[PDB]
């Protein structure tokens, strides 16, 4: 079952009724769901994914030209004119120049000069916008009692469904049930408003690297730029932000392209969000979610079953996680199933007493064959315990000591 | 001959014998050098050439990874070891990282992760030295005296010299003597230390741009770099200013590289000089230097010959230039040669009397043959003149008024 | 009226160095693009270079960057070719050809100069 | 890196025939500057055709310059045996360079 490795794990324990249970689901984050007379199941946000991200303005970030032209007149000879000054694509600078006899013209003074080249892109970088309606959340769930091979690995267990589930929440559809088989169903209403205003919001990407950064800063920047996208050729506008016309020549002056912004925009961006787009579809990791849980139709798998009278093995001794729980995988060589597992911790071995709780609740032996394999998690109190599992004499037990640190 | 287009030009008139005078050469700039009884010459540097220019350190500002990988190892499972992170051409990181039952390990805890990757540059600009030892200056020399094809046209037959001719110095050479035929010659003594201190300052390369930087500003710039030139295959030292690691996955971390910095570096450099590098040799415009002309070997074509008699006319009409001078050419049908210019400027055409000096020292018909070209230069007083050329009727007259404003 | 003479050609070692010349008569070289264009025994043409008129630029082919340098000197009507670290595949007829940058005729300045006049071109054999 | 030209075009007397020059949107598309040479086996080069359509002086009215999308053509109209010789299209690059075809070579039939 999830949340067990997790490190950013919520402990949440219903009352008797319970009914409904509010939580807060959160990337990076679980949330483990325990109640009275339910089984203990583990829910968490697993993707935030956006849609039918439309374009808005694209910026070009490294730029080169091609094919450069002048042509001058000389004093009082009317002004230059060159051929693509009337061009969409070419960028052109006018300009006088000193002229004399030793150039060709008649008087001296100044002259004229209008120089031109063939703006091309190279690489640019796309700004999408973020409407609240393509929001679409995957909430992932799994249930306490079965296994060990089924953790975070083999996550295709949603077509067997009854321990695992997924469902899939919109903003106009907050609503949705998932039924879990033989355990019964859980409903969720959440609401996604408290995550974050994408209303002053852009999703950009960058040589296949991606940022959320804001409005303003992104009408701002002195690249340029075209609406798009990209209609077969673009036109750009402000081709001066990365062209610039040096020297003075009688006959020419020199176009110039400054070098890729890539590095300075990658420089003034780190202060932003990240994203991911797998595939053609962004994937945020920056969210946030608070939920409400329907249980008045989930239920242990419904039998009171005859307890396991048969010999448990440790196969993998008990591990303290992060958060003070024990973790216990066992093998039951007996053929009595599905059984109810005796299984508790003990501060006295005469009486028994039962200290601590259990988070798997009520443990129960899937399957009926010998041999089975299953794991359990227990909360043990401070101090020393014994972590006892079976009855009779067929009963192992593991000394523990929970220094709640 | 040059200058007269030139706008930055240096009008200079010596003694009477004089022998040395000093004049100041400088890209961009003419020196007019006028003296009695010595023919005007136009002086001009036209190039600053470095050569033999040894690397100090070249730096990455374009980079890219590649054949990523990584190892780890279970909490208490010995520190993870990848082949490569003794490769000096990969960069890596070691790191601790969340582990649990989940991902593999029998405990929950902090466990062992190293990820490396091939560090490979793209593009790396190149900083080189500059010592005076290979310094070369170019100085071209030009005699007022006929024609006026060979003006900053004609450059070809400045070998076969008369009256065009070339000079080189070096720092270690400052000494140079150059001859004009039947002219003489002319004696320069340079002082180049005056020009500009080399001591401070680096050759930087960059993608076919080059520039003169400070020292301390090329050292300080945060890139991988290495000192040297090649090696074959470099080795860069600091490849972490470029790359850096993301993530935390169970079994691997994220490499990335930022973009290329050549717009940062381009925006943080327009405050240099810049040069060019034709070819394997640098080309520097920013310079300056004091010279001394020994001028006592430099005399007229020494004859007084008898006058032009014949007529001349005006092929192209005077024009003023950018200082107040007066251009005047004129196609001279006569077979008197090589004869004496009459040339003056007369506010009163009684007594002629002589206003004004000339520019063009002894003007002189070079050719014998009839119908000859010549170029010749005035200095007008302010105001109304007349520009009077030939003898008895058959000369020419021009008006012309120098407001001076 | 337009003459291009070439000079250099022969045998050179593989992975050596050899220095190829052009000298120009006839018309005003500091106005032309000059290319070198070579040309294989029996094969189709392969453009080589260019320099321009003043030498402010100079671009290669993708086949030859960061082995051959052009250059030229105008004050001579001469330019060079320095092949460096060569091949075997760059032996061939090795064609000097120039281009005038006059556009608009004395009033255009032109990058694209077109390749309108051509040498005989000297034959460069990369043989041991 | 090449333009794609045919590797032999056959025409009988008096007929017009046609030669491709494709390229890219960055060679033949992106500018009006292919240019057509004819090479006689074992001679200098000669340009026969310039910006696109354009002959210099000294050229015979029968080569025509076309040019279509990213395909640049050449028209040889009223083929004599003179026409029999290799024949290049060149183009400016939007990466500042020139480039060569493979070269068709053209034979007159009959």
């Known amino acids: 079952i999830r949340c067990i490795g997790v490190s950013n794990r919520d402990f949440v324990e219903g009352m008797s009724g319970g009914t409904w249970v509010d939580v807060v689901l959160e990337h990076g984050g679980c949330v483990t769901v325990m109640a009275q007379d339910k089984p203990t199941v583990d829910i968490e946000l697993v993707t935030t994914t956006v849609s039918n991200m439309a374009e808005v303005r694209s910026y070009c970030y490294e730029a080169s030209i091609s094919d450069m032209a002048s042509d001058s007149r000389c004093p009082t000879q009317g002004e230059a004119y060159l051929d693509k000054q009337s061009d969409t694509q070419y960028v052109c600078k006018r300009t006088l120049v000193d002229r004399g006899w030793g150039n060709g013209c008649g008087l001296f003074g100044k002259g004229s000069l209008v120089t031109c080249a063939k703006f091309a892109c190279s690489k640019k970088m796309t700004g999408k916008s973020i409407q609240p309606e393509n929001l679409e959340y995957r909430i992932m769930l799994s249930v306490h009692g079965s296994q060990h091979s089924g953790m975070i690995v083999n996550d295709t267990g949603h077509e067997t469904d009854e321990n695992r589930a997924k469902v899939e929440i919109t903003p106009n559809s907050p609503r949705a049930e998932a039924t879990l088989g033989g355990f019964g169903s859980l409903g969720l209403d959440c609401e996604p408003r408290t995550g974050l205003d994408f209303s002053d919001l852009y999703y950009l990407t960058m040589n296949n690297k991606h940022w959320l950064v804001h409005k303003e800063w992104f009408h701002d920047i002195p690249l340029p730029w075209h609406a798009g996208a990209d209609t077969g050729t673009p036109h750009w506008n402000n081709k001066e932000a990365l062209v610039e016309f040096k020297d003075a020549h009688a006959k020419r002056q020199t176009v110039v392209v400054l070098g890729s912004q890539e590095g300075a925009v990658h420089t003034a961006l780190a202060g932003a969000l990240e994203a991911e787009m797998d595939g053609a579809k962004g994937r945020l990791s920056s969210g946030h979610l608070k939920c409400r849980l329907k249980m008045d139709k989930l239920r242990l798998k419904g039998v009171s079953y005859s307890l396991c009278t048969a010999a448990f093995t440790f196969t993998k001794i008990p591990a303290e996680t992060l958060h003070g729980t024990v973790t216990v995988e066992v093998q039951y060589a007996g053929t009595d199933g599905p059984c109810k597992v005796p299984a508790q911790m003990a501060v006295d071995m005469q009486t028994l007493t039962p200290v601590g709780r259990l988070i798997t609740a009520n443990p129960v032996i899937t399957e009926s064959t010998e041999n089975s394999k299953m794991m359990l998690e227990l909360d043990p109190p401070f101090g020393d315990s014994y972590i006892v599992i079976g009855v009779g004499e067929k009963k192992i037990t593991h000394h523990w000591h929970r220094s709640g640190s | 001959i040059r200058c007269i287009g030139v706008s930055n030009r240096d009008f200079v008139e010596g003694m009477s014998g004089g022998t040395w005078v000093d004049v100041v050469l400088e890209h961009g700039g003419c020196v007019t050098v006028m003296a009695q009884d010595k023919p005007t010459v136009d002086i001009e540097l036209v190039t600053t050439t470095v050569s033999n220019m040894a690397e100090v350190r070249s730096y990455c500002y374009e980079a890219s990874i590649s054949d990523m990988a990584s190892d780890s190892r279970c909490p208490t499972q010995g520190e993870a070891y990848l082949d490569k992170q003794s490769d000096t051409q990969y960069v890596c990181k070691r790191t601790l990282v969340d582990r649990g039952w989940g991902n593999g390990c029998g405990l929950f805890g902090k466990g062992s992760l190293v990820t490396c990757a091939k560090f490979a540059c793209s593009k790396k600009m190149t900083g080189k030295s500059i010592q005076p030892e290979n310094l070369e200056y170019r100085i071209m020399l030009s005699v007022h005296g006929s024609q006026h094809s060979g003006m900053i046209v004609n450059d070809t037959g400045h070998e076969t010299d008369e009256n065009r001719a070339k000079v080189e110095i070096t720092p270690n050479s400052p000494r140079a003597e150059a001859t004009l035929g039947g002219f003489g010659s002319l004696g320069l003594d340079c002082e180049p230390r005056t020009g500009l201190d080399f001591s401070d300052l680096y050759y930087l390369t960059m993608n076919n741009k080059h520039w003169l930087v400070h020292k301390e500003w090329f050292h300080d710039i945060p890139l991988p770099w290495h000192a040297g030139a090649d090696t074959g295959t470099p080795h860069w030292n600091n490849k972490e200013a470029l790359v850096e690691f993301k993530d935390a996955h169970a079994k691997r971390q994220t490499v990335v590289v930022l973009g290329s910095q050549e717009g940062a570096v381009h925006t943080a450099l327009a405050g240099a000089l810049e040069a060019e590098m034709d070819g394997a040799k640098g080309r520097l415009s920013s310079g300056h230097l004091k010279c001394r002309l020994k001028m006592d070997k430099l005399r007229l074509k020494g004859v007084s010959y008898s006058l032009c008699t014949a007529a001349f006319t005006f092929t192209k009409i005077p024009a003023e230039t950018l200082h107040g001078t007066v251009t005047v050419e004129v196609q001279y049908a006569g077979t008197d040669g090589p004869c004496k210019v009459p040339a003056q400027m007369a506010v009163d055409m009684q007594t002629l009397t002589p206003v004004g000096r000339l520019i063009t020292a002894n003007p002189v018909i070079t050719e014998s043959t009839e119908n000859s070209k010549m170029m010749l230069e005035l200095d007008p007083p302010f105001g109304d003149s007349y520009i009077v050329i030939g003898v008895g009727e058959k000369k020419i007259t021009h008006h012309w008024h120098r407001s001076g404003s | 009226r337009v003459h291009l003479v070439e000079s250099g050609g022969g045998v050179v070692q593989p992975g050596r160095s050899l220095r190829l010349s052009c000298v120009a008569s006839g018309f005003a070289f500091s106005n032309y693009h000059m290319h070198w264009v070579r040309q294989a025994p029996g094969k189709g043409l392969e453009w080589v270079a260019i320099?321009?008129?003043?030498?402010?630029?100079?671009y290669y082919a993708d086949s030859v960057k960061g082995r051959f340098t052009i250059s030229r000197d105008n004050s001579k009507n001469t330019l060079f070719l320095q092949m460096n670290r060569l091949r075997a595949e760059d032996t061939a007829l090795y064609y000097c050809?120039?281009?005038?940058?006059?556009?608009?005729?004395?009033?255009?300045?032109?990058?694209?100069?077109?390749?309108?006049?051509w040498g005989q071109g000297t034959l460069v054999t990369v043989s041991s | 890196s090449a333009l794609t030209q045919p590797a032999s075009v056959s025409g009988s007397p008096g007929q017009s025939i046609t030669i491709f020059c494709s390229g890219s949107s960055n060679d033949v598309g992106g500018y009006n500057y292919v240019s057509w040479y004819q090479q006689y086996p074992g001679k200098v080069p000669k340009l026969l055709i310039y910006?696109?359509?354009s002959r210099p002086s000294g050229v015979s009215n029968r080569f025509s310059g076309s040019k279509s999308g990213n395909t640049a053509s050449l028209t040889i109209s009223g083929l004599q045996a003179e026409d029999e010789a290799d024949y290049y299209c060149?183009?400016?690059?939007?990466?500042?360079?020139?480039?060569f075809g493979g070269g068709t070579i053209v034979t007159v039939l009959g």
């Open positions: 060149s183009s400016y690059t939007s990466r500042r360079t020139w480039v």
């Open positions: 910006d696109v359509n």
């Open positions: 320099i321009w008129d003043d030498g402010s630029d100079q």
């Open positions: 050809v120039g281009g005038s940058s006059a556009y608009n005729g004395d009033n255009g300045w032109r990058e694209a100069a077109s390749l309108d006049d």
